[PDB]
Amino acid sequence: DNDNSSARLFERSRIKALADEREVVQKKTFTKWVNSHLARVSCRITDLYKDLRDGRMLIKLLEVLSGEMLPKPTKGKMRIHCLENVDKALQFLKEQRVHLENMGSHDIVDGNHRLVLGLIWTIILRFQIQD
Amino acid sequence: DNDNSSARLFERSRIKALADEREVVQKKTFTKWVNSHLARVSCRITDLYKDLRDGRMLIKLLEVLSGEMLPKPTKGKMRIHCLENVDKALQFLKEQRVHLENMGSHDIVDGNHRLVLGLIWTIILRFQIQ
Amino acid sequence: DDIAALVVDNGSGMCKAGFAGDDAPRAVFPSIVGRPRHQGVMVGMGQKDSYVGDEAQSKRGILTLKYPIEHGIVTNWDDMEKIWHHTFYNELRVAPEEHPVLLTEAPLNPKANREKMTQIMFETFNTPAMYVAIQAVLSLYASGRTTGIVMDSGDGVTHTVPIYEGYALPHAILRLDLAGRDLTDYLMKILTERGYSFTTTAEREIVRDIKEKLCYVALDFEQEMATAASSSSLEKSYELPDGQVITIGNERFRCPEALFQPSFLGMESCGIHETTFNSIMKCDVDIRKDLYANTVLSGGTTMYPGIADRMQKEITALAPSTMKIKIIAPPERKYSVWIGGSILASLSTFQQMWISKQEYDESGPSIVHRKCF
Amino acid sequence: SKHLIEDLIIESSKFPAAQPPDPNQPAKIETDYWPCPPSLAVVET
Ligand SMILES: Nc1ncnc2c1ncn2[C@@H]1O[C@H](COP(=O)(O)OP(=O)(O)O)[C@@H](O)[C@H]1O
């Protein structure tokens, strides 16, 4: 009742406000970081959530950072082709002993905010960059 | 019946075009091959569907490809002699282990594109120049 | 680049074939084998023993016509070998020794059928690789959505499968043997009522053409019967191949109505809408909401004008009110079972799926159960 | 081996047409003549 209404107020205000504030600032920081590496292949992204759905930006970012060419993307504009390209990128990430969890192809394709942010965070933190 | 109309629409267009382009380029390649192989004797094919109708061209092609003698083609302008001439070449193909399906002499005589193209393709693939 | 595989769809009525990655099949022809009936008095004619494909359909009067596939099961295998030989060497002019082959199968059928196809294609045609896929999975591929229920209906078999996020539920797969050939035979039996007589195998093709041209699914059946009995505005005229003119009339919508009431054929099974609802109801509680909005139709039998509205109305009548029903009927659905196959052979990971020649040589013809779903 | 005239015709028969496609032209899947609808992300971008 009223106590439940107060609990709903507390959670909806504080938890959601703090989570969204931190997530917005980290999204801006991650976008600014990834654009610098993506500029060398003359590719630029505007929104981090939507432009990683297709999967070509992710495979080109891994192309920049690794220095080794990846298998070519599948020629398609469907859902299953996006799943193929994201699976290729995640297989390459598994190949370099980087540990990822709760991260399937459909999570990146459907555009989950937390999992995309976690993938970018793991790329920033654990991955080895050579020049 | 807009969906049925669109189904007939797709059927009328894409299947027919995708078959037609393959058929055109295949027959253009086959004409070059048979002209190169028939140039040793004083013969030339200007149309694949019409020159192979009569049957002398086919029996001469089997003559030059096998290198080995074939029976006299029957002489006559009617359809029956043409059926005979196609049938003798088909029998000669039947001897040397080549396996044919849906092949009748009247199919070549009437001029079905699919069957004459398949016969030429089978000649290229399974028969031996030797 | 690697060699494009051959996508070959073996339906009960028609056989389709083409190259992987194309948007349309390159050769479509009926799966009929005919043999001569009368005696030949003309000497020097053709001595061919078996007409196959469109050539058999060209000359129907002097032939007895047979189907190597009935109810999704191959009954004669020499005729199947003739069908595949005419498909490969004549309709496509390709060499089968350098092309992987994809094949298409109904969900539930005799097991040994699979082995036989494998045992044929590695032995007589010497293909380097081959694969077998279910019809409705390929239809869902060609639909473009990962989650949905697929209802397929051809000339041999009707089947419904549910798939949620790429995961199939094997216990909820439903199969029904009411299909297009049963509708053709029922149309023959109901056209007997007007005095028209059709008995031979050649006349079954005529009846099939009449059914394809002049049949539609009525939205309401009793109202349509009352309308057709009250007035003659529903009649249509057809011209026979020998110049006779016949009038169908009330038989236009009674033949497709047998898809929803199988008691017309004496079958005690349920209708296609009841089969779809029962296949939905066998699934888990959570995934039903996505399955109600993603129903996909497929196969030629679902090309009757008005089938989608009737199916949506009946399923909405069965389903609870708070859920919404969407019937997805693409306009090119007749080739969907082919088209998804042409998609499936073009994927990158499907190169890891093929049953190689070496694997069959090592483990015999029973390998197909370990690899193919 | 020991016949170089018609094996090139065999190699020409592998492609969907009897001639190899132009490298400049795009594939059948991306040419926007494909009958199946595309994904939501691609059409949105
Ligand atoms: N335009 C149409 N309207 C109504 N029914 C049709 C139409 N076209 C085909 N059919 C029915 O569909 C059947 C062909 O289905 P098909 O797709 O060949 O099945 P499969 O290929 O799975 O064997 C025919 O027997 C016919 O009864």
**Secondary-structure percent of chain C, ordered helix, strand, coil, rounded to 5:** 45, 20, 40
Q: Is the CB of C303 under 6 A from ligand 1?
A: yes
Nearest CA distance, A25 vs chain C (angstrom): 33
Specify the residue for token string 């390459």.
Answer: A92
Nearest CA distance, B75 vs chain D (angstrom): 33
Q: Is the CB of C212 under 6 A from ligand 1?
A: yes
* Whole-number Å distance between alpha carbons of C181 and C13: 9
Kindly give, in sequence order, each residue whose CB lies less than 8 Å from that of residue C212, ignoring residues fewer than 6 positions away.
none
Residue A130 CB neighbour total at 10 angstroms: 6
- A and D: number of Cβ contacts within 8 A: 31
Residue B54 CB neighbour total at 10 angstroms: 17
Going by alpha carbons, the residue nearest to atom 21 of ligand 1 is C11
* Whole-number Å distance between alpha carbons of C248 and C216: 12
CB contact under 8 A, A78 and D39: yes
Nearest CA in chain D to B21: D17
Q: Where are the beta strands (DSSP E) in chain C?
A: 6-10, 14-19, 27-30, 33-36, 51-52, 63-66, 69-70, 73-74, 101-105, 129-134, 148-153, 158-164, 167-168, 174-176, 237-239, 245-247, 295-298, 327-328, 355-356
The pairing of beta strand C295-298 with beta strand C129-134: unpaired
* Whole-number Å distance between alpha carbons of B60 and B58: 5
Going by alpha carbons, the residue nearest to atom 2 of ligand 1 is C212
Going by alpha carbons, the residue nearest to atom 14 of ligand 1 is C300
Kindly give, in sequence order, each residue whose CB lies less than 8 Å from that of residue D6, ignoring residues fewer than 6 positions away.
B33, B124, B129
Which stretches within C92-200 are classed as H helix?
112-123, 135-143, 180-191
Which of B18, B22, B36 is opposite residue D18, by nearest beta carbon? B22
Residue B35 CB neighbour total at 10 angstroms: 14
Report residue C183 as tokens.
């509708």
**Secondary-structure percent of chain B, ordered helix, strand, coil, rounded to 5:** 70, 0, 30
Categorise residue C49: left if φ over 0, alpha if ψ from -120 to 50, beta otherwise.
alpha
Residues of chain C in contact with residue A106, where contact means CB-CB under 8 angstroms, are 146, 165
Atom of ligand 1 nearest to the CA of C337: 22
Residues of chain D in contact with residue B29, where contact means CB-CB under 8 angstroms, are 9, 12, 18
**DSSP 8-class letter at C193:** G
- What kind and span of H or E run contains C214? helix C201-214
Residue C66 near residue C35, CB atoms below 8 Å: yes
Helix, strand, or coil (residue B20): helix
Report residue C100 as tokens.
């992987």
- Between the CA of C244 and the centroid of ligand 1 the distance, in Å, is 25
Report residue C181 as tokens.
């050939």
Q: How far is the CA of A29 from the CAs of A23, A77, C99, in angstroms?
A: 10, 30, 50
Residues of chain B in contact with residue C50, where contact means CB-CB under 8 angstroms, are 101-102
* Whole-number Å distance between alpha carbons of A72 and B70: 56
* Whole-number Å distance between alpha carbons of C129 and C131: 7
Say what angle helices C77-85 and C112-123 make with each other, to 10 degrees: 40
Helix, strand, or coil (residue C356): strand
Q: How many residues does chain D have?
A: 45
Residue from D14, B65, A12 nearest C128 by CA: D14
* Whole-number Å distance between alpha carbons of D44 and D37: 13
Integer Rg of chain C from CA: 22
Q: Is the CB of C105 under 6 A from ligand 1?
A: no
Q: Is the CB of C169 under 6 A from ligand 1?
A: no
* Whole-number Å distance between alpha carbons of C254 and C183: 10
Q: How far is the CA of D13 from the CAs of B17, B97, B121, B127, C13, in angstroms?
A: 17, 23, 10, 17, 28
Q: Which residues are bridge partners to C99 per DSSP?
A: none
**Secondary-structure percent of chain D, ordered helix, strand, coil, rounded to 5:** 25, 0, 75
Nearest CA in chain A to C350: A84
Which of B14, B19, B106 is opposite residue C27, by nearest beta carbon? B19
Report residue B85 as tokens.
């001439």
Q: Which residues are bridge partners to C7 per DSSP?
A: C18, C102
Categorise residue B28: left if φ over 0, alpha if ψ from -120 to 50, beta otherwise.
alpha
Best substitution site from C109, C183, C259, C303 to test ligand 1's pocket, by max atoms within 8 Å of Cβ? Answer: C303
Which of D9, D13, D16 is opposite residue B33, by nearest beta carbon? D9
Kindly give, in sequence order, each residue whose CB lies less than 8 Å from that of residue C237, ignoring residues fewer than 6 positions away.
C245, C246, C247
Quoted resolution (Å) = 3.6
Residue C168 near residue C162, CB atoms below 8 Å: yes
Going by alpha carbons, the residue nearest to atom 15 of ligand 1 is C300
Residues of chain B in contact with residue C95, where contact means CB-CB under 8 angstroms, are 125
Helix, strand, or coil (residue A128): coil
What's the one-letter identity of residue C127? T
Going by alpha carbons, the residue nearest to atom 19 of ligand 1 is C154
Which of C23, C26, C143 is opposite residue D34, by nearest beta carbon? C23
* Whole-number Å distance between alpha carbons of C83 and C205: 19
- What kind and span of H or E run contains B56? helix B56-66
Residue B105 CA, chain-centre distance (Å), reads 11
Q: Where are the beta strands (DSSP E) in chain A?
A: none
Which residue pairs from A33-39 have beta carbons closer than 8 angstroms and sit at least 24 positions apart in sequence?
Answer: A33/A124, A34/A61, A34/A120, A37/A61, A37/A64, A37/A65, A38/A64
* Whole-number Å distance between alpha carbons of C138 and C154: 14
